[PDB]
Design a protein around this ligand. Structure first.
Ligand SMILES: Nc1ncnc2c1ncn2[C@@H]1O[C@H](COP(=O)(O)OP(=O)(O)O)[C@@H](O)[C@H]1O
Ligand SMILES: Nc1ncnc2c1ncn2[C@@H]1O[C@H](COP(=O)(O)OP(=O)(O)O)[C@@H](O)[C@H]1O
Ligand code: ALF
Ligand code: ALF
Ligand SMILES: [K+]
Ligand SMILES: [K+]
Ligand SMILES: [Mg+2]
Ligand SMILES: [Mg+2]
Ligand SMILES: [Zn+2]
Lengths: 300, 288
């Protein structure tokens, strides 16, 4: 019933963030889930916000900043902050730290605005920077709100003597600019509100059965349910299969099964599902669809 | 001879960045390396720049923002950007700005760069090892000095033009450029890349090695971690080892201008000082 953790509302894009520690399979799960959604008839966009993109390696397809068709109903984007800058200036250094998260938030605004997709899936950077991304809207909201407030105060002062001294300011134009800033703020705030709406946005946590991943994600889940991001599902990836006759495997599997117990105890309030480690690398559409089919069942 | 890739100049801090894709073992290798340097008599600081810190989990010790003793000759830091900010303001248009900036995207990389500035100055450690964030944000860190330089400059001329401490901002600008020189100086600074024998780690790290070129970062060594040992001989292991061994050949081909070393996958998780020392010893030999 992991597949039931995805809700859809006709005409309102569903958002899903796939997150977790480095190397646990975020990109693998994102690409498999997106392919599954596409086969299910959902118009799907999967977007990589990791500045070292891997979605293209994972699907084995060239993918750009603008939506790239992968297959019927599946489109993909690897965010390029240089291009994101251009699309910003045009609307109203592309290499400074923080730019990747600002450009990722811009993508969220775009698709929230158009509602062109049934579901948008974010393939996120490793934990620490994705928590920055997810807390960025509230910060952007406060900042824009403060700029507007200050700008209004300076305006009030500036025109306070128009009845005593010649005041040459253009109030019309000033009022339009304030109105434009307020509309930008309303957009930022609307997005913060969609992100913490469990009916629109969810976060699926990927872990592997190893303590360093478990502990990181346990800290992350706490930080998430602080920001009111709905984090309802945990996927345990790279689980060694029973078919392990050898002594090296047996030691590792025995330890993984104890970690699975810890996982089910630490995330006891969540739905937990497993994805087995394959005999080969998880890479390539056919392999990704088989992972999706075992996790979610056959596409509807 | 992998250990020969670490050059030391007494009185002058050696810098090492350990980088790579998520999950490949940067923290494990950083911590194993740091313990080895310390056992070897080098006064060693290992600094996590990954905003989700794992050094504490790896070394199994509580570590703070303040250098934290781990063993003789070894200290550790998990950067806390808020403490870095009050520290930085210690040396309401601004207040709200500082508190907001202290939680904003990019603050982690700025705070990491501040650590570099602090120790390149006071050569107090023989070696400082950066346990970096995964590839993509570590590139932002490594290109940050050029951006900082330009930015401070722009800020300079703009403060002047405004009239109604330019002597200080001006110093920090030279500090920044002195740091770039240290960073691109192969006698002082190196980058070790960690990869696992899987295509997604290989391609990401090949691309990253190219972006470091542009920055003149000296990358001289590749560590291939989590290599399945030969003993494993069940059907499942053999199939995986056979693939890894083809990936090792690709790694050696693609990083042919670098020295390549392997670290075996253990039968348990790599963590705790005892296990980490075994890894350093298998990788670098006994200390001195
Ligand atoms: N279930 C699996 N079985 C086998 N290999 C896997 C599995 N899931 C992920 N991988 C491999 O593990 C590595 C990390 O997966 P990746 O999706 O890149 O992770 P992240 O996006 O979290 O960095 C890749 O080499 C991928 O092929
Ligand atoms: N050689 C190894 N053998 C077994 N487990 C390992 C080995 N190297 C690392 N690990 C395990 O792999 C996972 C990731 O290692 P970690 O150092 O956190 O990576 P990164 O810093 O690149 O995120 C951890 O659970 C760690 O214990
Ligand atoms: F997943 Al990491 F450093 F913890 F890349
Ligand atoms: F290592 Al990644 F997404 F590639 F965490
Ligand atoms: K990546
Ligand atoms: K981490
Ligand atoms: Mg990924
Ligand atoms: Mg790490
Ligand atoms: Zn085996």
């Amino acid at each position: 019933a992991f597949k039931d953790l995805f809700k859809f509302n006709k005409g309102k894009t569903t958002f899903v963030f796939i997150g977790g520690k480095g190397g646990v399979g975020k990109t693998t799960i994102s690409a498999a889930t997106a392919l599954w959604m596409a086969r299910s008839g959902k118009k799907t966009l999967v977007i990589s916000t990791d500045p070292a993109h891997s979605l293209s390696d994972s699907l084995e397809r060239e993918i750009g900043h603008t939506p790239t068709k992968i297959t019927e109903n599946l489109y993909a984007v690897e965010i390029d902050p240089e291009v994101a800058m251009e699309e910003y200036q045009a609307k109203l250094a592309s290499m400074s730290p923080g730019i990747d998260e600002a450009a990722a938030f811009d993508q969220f605004l775009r698709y929230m605005t158009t509602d062109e997709y049934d579901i948008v899936i974010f393939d996120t950077a490793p934990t620490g920077h994705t928590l920055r991304l997810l807390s960025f809207p509230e910060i952007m909201d406060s900042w824009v709100g403060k700029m507007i407030k200050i700008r209004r105060q300076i305006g009030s002062m500036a025109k306070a003597f128009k009845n005593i001294l010649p005041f040459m300011g253009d109030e019309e134009e000033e009022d339009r600019a304030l109105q434009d800033m307020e509309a930008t703020k309303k957009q930022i705030n609307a997005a913060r509100e969609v992100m913490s709406d469990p009916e629109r946005t969810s976060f699926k946590m990927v872990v592997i059965p190893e303590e360093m991943s478990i502990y990181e994600s346990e800290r992350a889940m706490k930080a998430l349910e602080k920001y009111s991001i709905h984090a309802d599902g945990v996927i345990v990836n790279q689980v060694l299969p029973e078919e392990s006759d050898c002594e090296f495997c047996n030691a590792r599997r025995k330890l993984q099964q104890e970690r699975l117990k810890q996982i089910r105890e630490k995330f006891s309030d969540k739905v937990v599902a497993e994805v087995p480690l394959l005999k080969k690398e998880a890479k390539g559409i056919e392999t990704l669809e088989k992972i999706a089919e075992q996790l979610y069942g056959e596409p509807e």
